[PDB]
């Protein structure tokens, strides 16, 4: 796709030279916001836009990198992961079944599968409630 | 006298001591006297006077010079106080241009509402001179780059009229008609540099048409001749010499820009006068441009080599020998590539030209290039 909205989607200020000839018309902007990853081929030769993504959008990653299992993908560009971590209680002195909800903005770099494990880090706050961003599934 | 001027501006009984009114308007005094006298002339009526035409003429000259704000506003009030028929549709433009909120697009738009009447031309030229009188440090720059670019929305006759208006105070054709100029005034010499800056600004704003006015071009030549006159009339206390070096560099770079920008329907058949002035500029030291940033000397020589018409006034003097000498210096700078391109352009535009003088210049150029283009060791750009 190229549009889903009345407005236009475009990488801001990374434009081509609109006089001379190049076979891209927009230099798709490379970035990596850290964490030692190699840049993805979908970002080098991709087609989406995603201003909340950490590979073309202008948001940065650092801080709290955590993991979990994907259970919910039904929203728009944001998936909910399951940090299924066991807790401890001073009453029982045993272990118990616990998990919390963590939503994370999915990126269309690689596909959005229901069930995989992701490695997501703390970003500048993309929305009202979601705080992290997908850097790698 | 300041109390007398204030009392005569308070008690408004005009046409009772109006005997020396136009003589005082054509005479000189201080600025504290000039502000009160322009306030009195705006408080009067000027319909029937000793000479109402002379009063309007002094008002136009005051709104021209004006020191860019105050007498501009006072003379605009005087011009509205005169017979201002067909100007109530431009009184908003006059008040805006005299005011310090002179949005230049707004002034040229309110005049474009007052257009098809042509009764705003003298006021617009005086407003252009007021906006051109801005002086020094980046506010003057932000105003001048606005003014010289925004005055391009005007008539094709009125642009040459404003150029002649700049030409008027420092034309000096009666001074330079006999041999050259002999009187040196630094205050008028600075106005020559102001005319040079305004002409370069107008050329850079509109470098296709450029609007040639012949007396303005000859006055620019007279300013460059006054620069060479001061250089031969060295004033070695040398504030005047520094001013003359500031005038001649910008003057040569401006005179090269007009020819090299228009280059098709300008530079009329009287090119021998400009060739004589360039011969006077080269007779000091023809090879004084051996640097790579050789400004306007190599540009005029290369433009005369490029445009095939100018070879006649080129070969009038021996100037191709001068360009070949500056090219054939031993340790010549990176302008040697422009000199070789000049040889390429002057081979098929002088050796394919009229045989009497242009082929003679081409023969001299080929004789220079046979025994003077030996060290071809340009180890830089392979292009």
């Amino acid at each position: 796709t190229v549009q889903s909205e009345r407005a236009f989607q475009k990488q801001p200020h990374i434009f081509n030279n609109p006089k001379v000839k190049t076979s891209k018309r927009t230099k798709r902007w490379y970035k990596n916001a850290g964490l030692g990853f190699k840049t993805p081929k979908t970002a080098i030769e991709g087609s989406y836009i995603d201003k909340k993504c950490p590979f073309t959008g202008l948001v940065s990653i650092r801080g709290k990198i955590l993991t979990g299992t994907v259970v919910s993908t039904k929203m728009h560009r944001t998936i909910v992961i399951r940090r299924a971590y066991l807790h401890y209680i001073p009453k029982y002195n045993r272990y118990e079944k616990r998990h919390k909800n963590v939503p994370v903005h999915v990126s269309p770099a690689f596909r959005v599968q229901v069930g995989d494990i992701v490695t997501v880090g703390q970003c500048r706050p993309i929305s009202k409630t979601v705080r992290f961003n997908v850097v790698k599934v | 006298t300041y109390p007398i001027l204030i009392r005569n501006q308070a008690l408004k009984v005009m046409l009772s001591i109006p005997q020396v009114a136009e003589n005082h308007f054509v005479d000189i005094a201080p600025f504290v006297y000039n502000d009160f006298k322009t306030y009195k002339d705006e408080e009067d009526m000027e319909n029937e006077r000793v000479i109402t035409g002379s009063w309007t003429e002094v008002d136009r000259n005051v709104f021209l010079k004006t020191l860019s704000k105050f007498k501009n506003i006072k003379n605009v009030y005087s011009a509205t106080e005169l017979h201002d028929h067909l100007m109530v549709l431009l009184g908003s433009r006059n008040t805006d241009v005299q005011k310090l909120a002179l949005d230049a697009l707004l002034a040229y738009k309110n005049p474009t509402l007052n257009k098809y009447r042509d009764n705003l031309k003298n006021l617009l030229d005086d407003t252009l001179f007021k906006d051109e009188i801005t002086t020094f440090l980046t506010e003057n720059g932000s105003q001048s780059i606005k003014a010289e670019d925004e005055k391009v929305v005007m008539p094709y006759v009125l642009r040459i009229f404003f150029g002649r208006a700049q030409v008027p105070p420092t034309s000096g054709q009666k001074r330079s008609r006999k041999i050259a100029v002999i009187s040196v005034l630094p205050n008028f010499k600075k106005p020559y540099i102001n005319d040079f800056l305004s002409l370069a600004s107008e050329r850079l704003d509109y470098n296709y048409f450029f609007g040639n006015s012949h007396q303005i071009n000859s006055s620019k030549a007279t300013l460059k001749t006054i620069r060479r006159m001061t250089g031969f009339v060295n004033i070695v206390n040398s504030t005047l010499s520094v001013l003359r070096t500031n005038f001649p560099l910008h003057t040569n770079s401006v005179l090269q820009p007009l020819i090299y920008s228009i280059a098709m329907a300008y530079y009329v058949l009287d090119t021998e006068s400009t060739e004589e002035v360039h011969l006077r500029k080269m007779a000091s030291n023809l090879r004084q441009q051996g640097l790579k940033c050789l400004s306007s000397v190599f540009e005029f020589v290369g433009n005369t080599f490029d445009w095939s018409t100018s070879m006649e006034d080129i070969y009038a003097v021996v100037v191709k020998p001068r360009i070949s000498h500056f090219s054939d210096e031993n340790l010549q700078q990176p302008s040697s590539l422009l000199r070789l391109f000049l040889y390429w352009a002057h081979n098929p535009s002088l050796y394919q030209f009229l045989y009497y003088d242009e082929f003679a210049t081409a023969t001299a150029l080929m004789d220079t290039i046979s025994n003077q283009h030996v060290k071809e060791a340009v180890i830089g750009p392979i292009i």
Binding site: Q3 | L105, L106, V152, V153, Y208
Partner: protein
């Protein structure tokens, strides 16, 4: 939040606004002129705003023609015309060239008048031109 601004076209009049921590912001209202820029070879000029044709979120602004960010324009073409025929010696892209004798150009606003108080246009050229002519076709 604070009050809306909804700045209009014609008769420049700007509120003086001091905000949180210095940062003097220019709440411009009723913008009259605009600085626009050739996006492929870089020349900018102050240029007189005519109207706003497109709004990318609400056709209430296509009705009332309110100046904001990201609203496609048709503005003046005359100072770009004077430079285009006064320094070239040509006096003339092809679909940009088609917008010459129509008396209107096409561009977009990025600077917020309720925040910065400026007025910026970039002359759209290429796939921007293609998408925005398709947006003109989407309206019409």
């Amino acid at each position: 939040g604070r009050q809306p601004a909804n700045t209009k076209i014609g008769a420049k009049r700007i509120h003086s606004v001091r905000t949180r921590g210095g940062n003097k912001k220019y709440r411009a209202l009723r913008i009259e002129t605009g600085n626009f820029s050739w996006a492929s070879e870089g020349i900018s000029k102050k240029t007189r705003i005519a109207g706003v044709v497109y709004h990318p979120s609400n056709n209430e602004l296509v009705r009332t023609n309110t100046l904001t960010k990201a609203a496609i324009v048709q503005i003046d073409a005359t100072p770009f015309r004077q430079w285009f025929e006064a320094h070239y010696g040509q006096t003339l892209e092809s679909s940009v060239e088609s917008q010459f004798s129509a008396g209107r150009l096409y561009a977009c606003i990025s600077s917020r008048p309720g925040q910065s108080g400026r007025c910026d246009g970039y002359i759209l050229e290429g796939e921007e031109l293609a998408f925005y002519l398709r947006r003109l076709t989407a309206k019409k």
